[PDB]
C-alpha cells in the first residue's frame, strides 16, 4: 500500500499483471532530436496519468551497430508499468561500451536538466536507472561504475572486455542468451555477474536456446523481470519481491542466480 511506501504505482502485481504486454498506465512519447548534446537523441515514454505521483525512470541503450529500434519494445512495456523509459541512440553506431555508459548519463541527464515539462514534472530524479543491450550492457555496467547513486542496472546479454565489476555498488540484474556466440555468456555475462559483489542485489539470469538477439524482439520472460527488478529497485516496491525471491522458475529460464533475500 501507498502507506508504507510513497513511490508504490499500480495495482497489486500478479503473474499476470508483470507477464502483460500494456501494463495499468496509458503511456504517451516525446521524441528527442539527436542534435541533443551528448548521446544521439531518442524517444521518451512516459505514463500519462499523474494521479498516483512522480515515477522513476531507466535509460535504454542498443548494442554495436543498433539502433533504438532494436529496443522499441521496452518502451511502451515497461512504462506502461509506470517509469518514465528512455530508448536512446548513440552517437555513432560504432560506440563502445564505455561510450556507451556515458551517453546513457547524459540521456538520463536530459531527462532531469532540458526535458519538456510533460516529462519534468513526471519525473523523480532522484530515482534512475540504465539498462542496455550487448555493449550497451557493457555500457550499463560501466555507468554504474561511473554514477553508483543510481538505483538499478539491467546488462541484456551484455558485451565488454573489461570482464571485472567487483567495485559496483548498484542493483545489477544480468541477463545472458545460453547461445550468444557474439557475448558467449561464458566468457561475458557469467563472469560479469560472478565479479559483482557477493553482498550486492543481484541476479542472473539466462535465457534456455536464446541468441544474441533475443532481447531485441517481445519476450515475456526478459518483461516480467526487467519489470519486477526496476520496481524492487527504483520503486523500492517490495510487492515485486515475490517474483524475484527465490529464484524464477520459468520453464524459459537454463539457470538462475541471485543474492536473494534482497533486505
Ligand atoms: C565488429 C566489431 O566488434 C563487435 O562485433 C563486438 C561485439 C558487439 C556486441 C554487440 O553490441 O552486439
Ligand atoms: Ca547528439
Ligand atoms: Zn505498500
Ligand atoms: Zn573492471
Ligand atoms: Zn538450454
Same mark, same amino acid.
Given at each position: 500500500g501507498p502507506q508504507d511506501n510513497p513511490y508504490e504505482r499500480g495495482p497489486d502485481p500478479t503473474e499476470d499483471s508483470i507477464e +502483460?504486454? $500494456?501494463?495499468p498506465f496509458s503511456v504517451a512519447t516525446e521524441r528527442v532530436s539527436?542534435?541533443? !548534446?551528448?548521446?544521439?537523441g531518442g524517444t521518451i515514454y512516459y505514463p500519462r496519468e499523474t494521479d498516483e505521483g512522480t515515477f522513476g525512470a531507466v535509460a535504454v541503450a542498443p548494442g554495436?551497430? +543498433? !539502433? /533504438?529500434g532494436s529496443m522499441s519494445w521496452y518502451g511502451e512495456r515497461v512504462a506502461s508499468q509506470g517509469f518514465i523509459v528512455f530508448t536512446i541512440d548513440t552517437?555513432? $553506431? @560504432?560506440? /563502445?561500451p564505455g561510450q556507451r555508459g556515458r551517453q546513457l548519463l547524459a540521456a538520463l541527464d536530459y531527462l532531469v536538466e532540458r526535458s519538456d515539462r510533460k516529462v519534468r514534472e513526471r519525473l523523480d530524479p532522484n530515482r534512475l536507472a540504465v539498462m542496455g543491450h550487448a555493449m550497451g550492457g557493457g555500457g550499463s555496467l560501466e555507468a554504474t561504475v561511473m $554514477?553508483?547513486?543510481?538505483?538499478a542496472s539491467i546488462p541484456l546479454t551484455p558485451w565488454n572486455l573489461?570482464?571485472?565489476?567487483?567495485?559496483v555498488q548498484v542493483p545489477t540484474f544480468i541477463i545472458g542468451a545460453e @547461445?550468444?556466440?557474439? +557475448?558467449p555468456v561464458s566468457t561475458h555475462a557469467k563472469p560479469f555477474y560472478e565479479s @559483482?559483489?557477493?553482498?550486492?542485489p543481484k541476479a542472473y539470469m539466462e535465457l534456455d536456446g +536464446?541468441?544474441?538477439?533475443?532481447?531485441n524482439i517481445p519476450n515475456t520472460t526478459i518483461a516480467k523481470y526487467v519489470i519486477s527488478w526496476l520496481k524492487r529497485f527504483?520503486?523500492?516496491?517490495? $510487492?515485486?519481491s515475490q517474483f524475484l525471491c527465490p529464484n524464477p522458475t520459468d520453464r524459459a529460464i537454463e539457470e538462475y542466480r541471485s543474492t536473494c533475500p534482497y533486505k
Open positions: +502483460a504486454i $500494456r501494463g539527436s542534435f541533443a !548534446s551528448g548521446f544521439g554495436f551497430t +543498433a !539502433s /533504438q552517437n555513432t $553506431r @560504432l560506440d /563502445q $554514477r553508483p547513486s543510481l538505483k573489461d570482464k571485472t565489476w567487483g567495485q @547461445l550468444d556466440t557474439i +557475448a @559483482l559483489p557477493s553482498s550486492l +536464446a541468441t544474441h538477439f533475443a532481447p527504483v520503486d523500492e516496491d517490495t $510487492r515485486y
